[PDB]
Automatic annotation (TrEMBL), chain D:
Similarity comment: family membership: Belongs to the RNA polymerase beta chain family.
Boundaries of every RNA polymerase Rpb2 domain copy: 17-49
Location relative to the cell: Nucleus
Protein name in the entry: DNA-directed RNA polymerase subunit beta
Coiled coil start-end: none
Superkingdom of source: Eukaryota
Biological role: RNA-dependent RNA polymerase that catalyzes the extension of a non-coding RNA (ncRNA) at the 3'-end using the four ribonucleoside triphosphates as substrates. An internal ncRNA sequence near the 3'-end serves as a template in a single-round Pol II-mediated RNA polymerization reaction. May decrease the stability of ncRNAs that repress Pol II-mediated gene transcription. DNA-dependent RNA polymerase catalyzes the transcription of DNA into RNA using the four ribonucleoside triphosphates as substrates.
Section of the entire sequence shown: 637 to 685 of 1174
Length: 48, 87, 117, 49, 154, 200
């Protein structure tokens, strides 16, 4: 359910992105799996 | 563990295929659990209460059953899929 | 001088190595699996900063102003926007012996000015 | 105060600990998350000073 | 000011006095069709595939479902009869009486959440009300995959 | 118990009979008297309209309008799908202007649905990205809201669609002119009314 919500939210999967975007974004780990990146970590944490 | 992990362990197990030609599948499907029970020589059922288990030095345990489906294929892709229930 | 990065071949995108023009006495960055070549401009192929005078302000990121566990002060307003509140903290990075120096970050959103005193 | 009032009568109204968690007034925090928490020992720490 | 002229129908609502957000627990279900014993379609889930867990869920679903039926009074007038009644008590607490089963109704302020009621009209949603309070139902008292004993050892 | 079809029907009929027993005393507290006993019925009036639950990430109330007026302003807000120049579909959140609220109050006091020749102006407040979940989407939990109509009963309605808005300079004025319901919308209202009727 959390992965579904994250995809549904503004998280970008790891195969979809270009490596240039990682630098300033927030990596997102779920149970130790790096599953994507997010550009607005603060409000994502608020939502969660 | 009882409610999720046993079923996951059973289902994650790879089905066993045997070659002597005839082949077999033997897939385990679903697990059932009874309540703790004791049978004497008569075989009449009775709930094993924990105090009786303490006094008679019994193990307080429940029997585990599983649904098994056996399929046999020899020629012409003829399926002999038979199901054994509550094994 | 500072650190000298690395270059990648335009064709195979492999690392370029430094070579000199024996005949012309010019520094070239030349691939080693393909045959691409390039003309250097820095002329400094290597650097080693023993004193390790590195700027901690470059590493600070403005997001730490959202950390609720950092102390906040109202006695060091930031120059860039004059906001009165900042978080402060120490470097806590190896290669920091006199590391009790404080660093400040403005807590006003969309300013994120880092400084030291 | 209303949460305390409802808990005082938990025998009758059936308002339980689970309702505190459901109303978002209490939270479970594990050690890693505790690393990021700013924790008051008592509500006296929230009083202005 | 770019003026976008849209012709939308006016929805006349009647939201009464109090609007409460309800998250139905797993043990309470709502059947929207009227109960007519002649037309009452039963679940009649395949006996076979149910487990003891499903049965307790089915039994709890039959008794704890809010239903309504149309009964003809003596004078032939169709009176809508509900199987559920909400009682406002003198102390301000609400209890839901479903048949003989009592569920305590807790009024909790939806603090933090912004639940709004909208109506879908054509290609847009029209706001109607903001949900302020959530109702939670609990059985008033504790007094409100298994298998049966195998007949022979194994 | 409830193995046979007939046994299930009798148990349900028994619940209706039990609900008709007059409630005079509190089940547990002897000194607590029932103030009002209201039967619970489906909302026969509002079921015709498709109700949606909209969850905002942040408070949609305009910063400057505090208190009682913000709730009235938010209760009449309009959300419309907008396509950006790049073809991306976003939802603009429109709030009524003060003038519209006065015109609307006149309509409510004068028991007139809408003044045919009145233009109700809405001003765009915020743009949102929309997630819509309908009854047909896998995992949609059916949520209800209860309406207490004093003296009549408690009416429950379903939230068929759940819209979650996550925060994404268009001074866009949504000019709404009210018209009468078209035949297709009325047919849709009858189809929804039929869900409350026992489908022969
Ligand atoms: Zn190369
Ligand atoms: Zn600043």
């Amino acid at each position: 359910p959390i992965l579904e919500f994250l995809e549904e939210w503004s998280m970008e999967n790891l195969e979809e992105i270009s490596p240039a975007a990682i630098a300033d974004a927030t990596k997102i780990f779920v149970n130790g799996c790096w599953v994507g990146i997010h550009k607005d970590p603060e409000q994502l944490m608020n939502t969660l | 563990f009882i409610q999720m992990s046993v079923q996951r362990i059973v289902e994650d197990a790879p089905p066993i295929d045997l070659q002597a030609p005839p082949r077999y599948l033997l897939k385990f499907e679903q697990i059932y659990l009874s309540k703790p029970t004791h049978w004497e020589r008569d075989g009449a059922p009775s709930p094993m209460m924990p105090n009786e288990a303490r006094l008679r030095n019994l193990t307080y345990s429940a029997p585990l059953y599983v649904d098994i489906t056996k399929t046999v294929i020899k020629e012409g892709e003829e399926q002999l899929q038979t199901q054994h229930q509550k094994t | 001088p500072g650190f000298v990065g690395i270059r990648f071949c335009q064709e195979c995108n492999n690392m370029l190595y430094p070579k000199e023009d024996k005949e012309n006495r010019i520094l070239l960055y030349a691939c080693r699996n393909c045959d691409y070549q390039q003309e250097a401009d820095n002329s400094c192929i290597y650097v080693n900063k023993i004193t390790h005078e590195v700027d901690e302000l470059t590493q600070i990121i403005a997001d730490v102003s959202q950390d609720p566990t950092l102390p906040r002060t109202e006695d060091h307003p930031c120059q860039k926007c004059g906001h009165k509140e900042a978080v402060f903290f120490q470097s806590h990075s190896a290669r920091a012996e006199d590391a009790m120096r404080l660093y400040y970050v403005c807590t006003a959103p969309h300013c994120g000015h880092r400084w030291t005193e | 105060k209303r949460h305390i009032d409802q808990l005082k009568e938990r025998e009758y109204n059936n308002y339980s600990w689970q309702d505190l968690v459901a109303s978002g007034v209490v939270e479970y925090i594990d050690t890693l998350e505790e690393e990021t928490v700013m924790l008051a020992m008592t509500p006296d720490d929230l009083q202005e000073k | 000011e770019t003026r976008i002229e849209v012709e939308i129908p006016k929805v006349n609502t009647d939201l009464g006095n109090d609007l409460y957000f309800v998250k139905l627990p797993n043990f309470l279900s709502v059947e929207p069709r009227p109960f007519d014993p002649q037309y009452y379609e039963d679940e009649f889930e395949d006996e076979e595939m149910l487990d003891e867990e499903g049965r307790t869920r089915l039994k709890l679903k039959v008794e704890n479902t809010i239903r309504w039926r149309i009964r003809r009074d003596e004078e032939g007038n169709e009176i809508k009869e509900s199987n559920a009644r909400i009682v406002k008590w003198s102390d301000g607490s609400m209890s839901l009486h479903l048949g003989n089963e009592v569920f305590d109704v807790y009024k909790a302020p939806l603090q933090g959440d912004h639940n709004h009621l909208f109506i879908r009209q054509g290609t847009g949603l029209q706001g109607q009300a903001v949900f302020k309070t959530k109702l939670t139902f609990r059985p008033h008292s504790t007094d409100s995959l298994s298998l049966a004993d195998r007949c022979s050892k194994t | 118990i409830y193995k046979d079809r007939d046994s299930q029907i009798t148990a349900i009929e028994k619940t209706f009979e039990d609900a008709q027993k007059s409630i005079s005393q509190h089940y547990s507290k002897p000194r607590v008297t029932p103030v009002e006993v209201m039967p619970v019925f489906p909302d026969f009036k509002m079921w015709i309209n498709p109700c949606a639950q909209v969850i905002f990430d942040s408070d949609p109330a305009p910063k400057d309008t505090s208190g009682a007026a913000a709730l009235e302003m938010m209760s009449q807000a309009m959300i419309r799908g907008m396509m950006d120049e790049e073809g991306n579909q976003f939802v603009a959140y429109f709030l009524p202007v003060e003038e519209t609220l006065k015109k609307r109050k006149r309509d409510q006091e004068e028991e007139m649905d809408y003044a045919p020749d009145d233009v109700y102006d809405y001003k765009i407040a915020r743009e949102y990205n929309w997630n819509v979940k309908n009854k047909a989407s896998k995992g949609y939990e059916e949520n209800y809201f209860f309406i207490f109509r004093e003296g009549d009963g408690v009416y429950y309605n379903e939230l068929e669609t759940r819209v979650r808005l996550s925060k994404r300079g268009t001074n866009a004025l949504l000019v709404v002119k009210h018209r009468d319901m078209n035949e297709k919308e009325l047919e849709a209202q009858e189809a929804r009314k039929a869900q409350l009727e026992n489908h022969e």
